[PDB]
Amino acid sequence: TNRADTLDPALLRPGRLDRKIEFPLPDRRQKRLIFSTITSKMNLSEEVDLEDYV
Amino acid sequence: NLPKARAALTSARTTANAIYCPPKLQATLDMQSGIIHAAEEKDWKTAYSYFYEAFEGYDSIDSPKAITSLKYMLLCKIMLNTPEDVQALVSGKLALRYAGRQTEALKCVAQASKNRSLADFEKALTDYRAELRDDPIISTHLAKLYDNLLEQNLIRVIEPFSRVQIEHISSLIKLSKADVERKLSQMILDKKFHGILDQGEGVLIIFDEPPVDKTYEAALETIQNMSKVVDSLYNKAKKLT
Amino acid sequence: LLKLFTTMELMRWSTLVEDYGMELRKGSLESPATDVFGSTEEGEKRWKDLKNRVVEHNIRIMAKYYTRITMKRMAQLLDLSVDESEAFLSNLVVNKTIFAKVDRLAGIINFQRPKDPNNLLNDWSQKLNSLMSLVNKTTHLIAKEEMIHNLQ
Amino acid sequence: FLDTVSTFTSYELMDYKTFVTYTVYVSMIALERPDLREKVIKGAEILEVLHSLPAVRQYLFSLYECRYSVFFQSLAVVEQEMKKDWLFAPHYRYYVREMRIHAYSQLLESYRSLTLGYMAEAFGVGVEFIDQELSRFIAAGRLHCKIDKVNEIVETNRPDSKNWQYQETIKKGDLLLNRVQKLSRVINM
């Protein structure tokens, strides 16, 4: 979830953390990718530029 | 030069790796593992996943080198012919981003590596001879396309009726005995083509019926039964002596 | 038209020329002839689509007597040549509507079914059809027997 | 020799390229054709150290092709080394004709109405060479075929569900039968 105040006395531990991996979120260069993939679902006239809002 | 890139590989993975923060020439090494090790015939998709890592590391790069940083992987999409990342590479912006004329060549490279008609291919063989200039190995890139197009033609011609004269099924290639007999016998040896050719009367005849588990499963389980009875032969030879 | 739709009754194609071409020799409505065969690069394609009818639909009426025919007899029955036969064999085998297999070791070939593809089906069809007929037999031979021996 | 990950060079390998020779010199016989493409097409970990040795790669791809005069060529290379490599000298005699018949099986699996002319393209003058060659392949219990002189028939044959797979059961359990029967006849007296 969003809030992280629930554990690590037992999830992420010395020994228990063998593939228990902390997962943050993605950097810049990712909004471009989402803009590339989800706007490829629509039809995209042939020229309305897209880096102008990243 | 692949042994020079091999001594440079064995120097790269510890000497360039002995230079801190290289996210720059490691993608160069990815292109190198996609041209040397695909020139070592490893796999289309392992080397092309290294081309995927290269394709997502070819940004913020100057224009007369990013105009030719896609030539290897897209003339390898000409090599691939199971292109499998049209929807990600060439719909993607790196083939739809740059000002020069080589990306305008890679546009029609992309669309021809989507369609692949003989009416486009054998006619733009002369239109892509200056695009055969940038072919690093002059065999496999076009040879997978046309040596796939062999059996493409064959399933276009042999399919609708099984047995046939060899001469009129070979009229669409005009050679009767040179390599199409070897290709059809090779598809017999690869089980793409189930039948019998001819040289005497020149009559190809397609037919097949392999699986009989009534014979196979029964008799091979009896072979296992006989092995088990031989395993009981020592209970026998033990109760006797 | 409709008599040509049921078994197609292997007529003369110049009697089709009679029927479908003396419609222009009508001292009445020629707007049927004008709409259908007054066309040239569509109506000529309808004339040869009706040659496609004679080959198409008459292979579907001749599909019974095969598993044995040469090629000359198929030319002598399709009301056309052997070259027109091979062109029509080409476009109807790429139709691949019913499974053809044609070969010229001597030419005894045909449009065909999948060529009796089974084993014991013959025992099933022949002996079980005929013998379950022969077991329904006694069950209605007693029927006939009782109904005729009510009186005599 | 499948694995090839942990044997770069230990103190027991004076030449890992001799391990490459040992894997090609047995993969050319034993390995099946989907196994052949699965080993030397789908994977490269032996193909680098034998892409330093291209005629080995060439011979395996010609084995994958069926071109036979280069089988004569490179099989003669392998047989020169088969005399000139140890652990082979009590054993080389089976190798030549075994690789030859390993090609001859798929050769006849091409088709049936074959000759010695269309095969003499691949053989040279394989006319009375194939006399003793293929006739003793017939008489060595091998190479199921029929062959004619002037009508010049060739035959590819043996569907597996025919008679011998039906036969092998009682082939075991007749000698096995009276074996266990006499073993059950020691019991009375």
From Swiss-Prot, chain A:
Name assigned to this protein: 26S proteasome regulatory subunit 6B
Organism of origin: Homo sapiens
Coiled-coil portions: none
Family: Belongs to the AAA ATPase family.
Highest taxon above the source species: Eukaryota
Interval of the full protein contained in this chain: 311 to 364 of 418
Localization, UniProt: Cytoplasm; Nucleus
Protein's job: Component of the 26S proteasome, a multiprotein complex involved in the ATP-dependent degradation of ubiquitinated proteins. This complex plays a key role in the maintenance of protein homeostasis by removing misfolded or damaged proteins, which could impair cellular functions, and by removing proteins whose functions are no longer required. Therefore, the proteasome participates in numerous cellular processes, including cell cycle progression, apoptosis, or DNA damage repair.
Subunit structure, as described in the record: Component of the 19S proteasome regulatory particle complex. The 26S proteasome consists of a 20S core particle (CP) and two 19S regulatory subunits (RP). The regulatory particle is made of a lid composed of 9 subunits, a base containing 6 ATPases including PSMC4 and few additional components. Interacts with NR1I3. Interacts with PAAF1. Interacts with TRIM5. Interacts with ZFAND1.
Disulphide connectivity of cysteines: none
From Swiss-Prot, chain B:
PTM description: Phosphorylated by AMPK.
Keyword Kinase attributed: no
GO biological process: proteasome assembly; proteasome-mediated ubiquitin-dependent protein catabolic process; stem cell differentiation; ubiquitin-dependent protein catabolic process
Induction text: By FOXO4; expression in embryonic stem cells (ESCs) is mediated by FOXO4.
Cellular localization per UniProt: Nucleus; Cytoplasm, Cytosol
Tissues where the protein occurs: Highly expressed in embryonic stem cells (ESCs). Expression decreases as ESCs differentiate.
Cross-link (Glycyl lysine isopeptide (Lys-Gly) (interchain with G-Cter in SUMO2)): 93
Gene Ontology CC entries for this record: cytosol; extracellular region; ficolin-1-rich granule lumen; membrane; nucleoplasm; nucleus; proteasome accessory complex; proteasome complex
Domain PCI: 43-211
Keyword terms, alphabetized: Acetylation, Cytoplasm, Isopeptide bond, Nucleus, Phosphoprotein, Proteasome, Ubl conjugation
An example Gene Ontology molecular-function term: structural molecule activity
Subunit structure: Component of the 19S proteasome regulatory particle complex. The 26S proteasome consists of a 20S core particle (CP) and two 19S regulatory subunits (RP). The regulatory particle is made of a lid composed of 9 subunits including PSMD11, a base containing 6 ATPases and few additional components.
Family per record: Belongs to the proteasome subunit S9 family.
Record protein name field: 26S proteasome non-ATPase regulatory subunit 11
The species this protein was found in: Homo sapiens
Shown residues within the full chain: 182 to 422 of 422
Curated annotation (Swiss-Prot), chain C:
Keywords, ordered alphabetically: Acetylation, Intellectual disability, Isopeptide bond, Proteasome, Ubl conjugation
Swiss-Prot/TrEMBL GO biological process terms: proteasome-mediated ubiquitin-dependent protein catabolic process
Cellular-component GO terms for this entry: cytoplasm; cytosol; extracellular exosome; extracellular region; ficolin-1-rich granule lumen; membrane; nucleoplasm; proteasome accessory complex
Domain PCI positions: 1-116
Domain of life, per lineage: Eukaryota
Residues bearing PTM N6-acetyllysine: 64
Keyword Ribonucleoprotein: no
Keyword Nuclease: no
Assembly and binders: Component of the 19S proteasome regulatory particle complex. The 26S proteasome consists of a 20S core particle (CP) and two 19S regulatory subunits (RP). The regulatory particle is made of a lid composed of 9 subunits including PSMD12, a base containing 6 ATPases and few additional components. Interacts with ERCC6.
Associated disease: Stankiewicz-Isidor syndrome: A neurodevelopmental disorder characterized by delayed psychomotor development, intellectual disability, behavioral disorders, mild dysmorphism, ophthalmologic anomalies, feeding difficulties, deafness, and variable congenital malformations of the cardiac and/or urogenital systems.
Family: Belongs to the proteasome subunit p55 family.
Protein name (Swiss-Prot/TrEMBL): 26S proteasome non-ATPase regulatory subunit 12
Residue span relative to the full protein: 305 to 456 of 456
UniProtKB/Swiss-Prot annotation, chain D:
Superkingdom of the organism of origin: Eukaryota
Keywords: Proteasome
GO process terms (BP): proteasome-mediated ubiquitin-dependent protein catabolic process
Domain PCI: 1-161
GO cellular component, one term: ficolin-1-rich granule lumen
Disulfide bonds: none
Subunit structure as annotated in this protein's UniProt entry: Component of the 19S proteasome regulatory particle complex. The 26S proteasome consists of a 20S core particle (CP) and two 19S regulatory subunits (RP). The regulatory particle is made of a lid composed of 9 subunits including PSMD6, a base containing 6 ATPases and few additional components.
Record's function text: Component of the 26S proteasome, a multiprotein complex involved in the ATP-dependent degradation of ubiquitinated proteins. This complex plays a key role in the maintenance of protein homeostasis by removing misfolded or damaged proteins, which could impair cellular functions, and by removing proteins whose functions are no longer required. Therefore, the proteasome participates in numerous cellular processes, including cell cycle progression, apoptosis, or DNA damage repair.
Family: Belongs to the proteasome subunit S10 family.
Name used for this protein in its record: 26S proteasome non-ATPase regulatory subunit 6
Gene: PSMD6
Residues of the full protein shown: 201 to 389 of 389
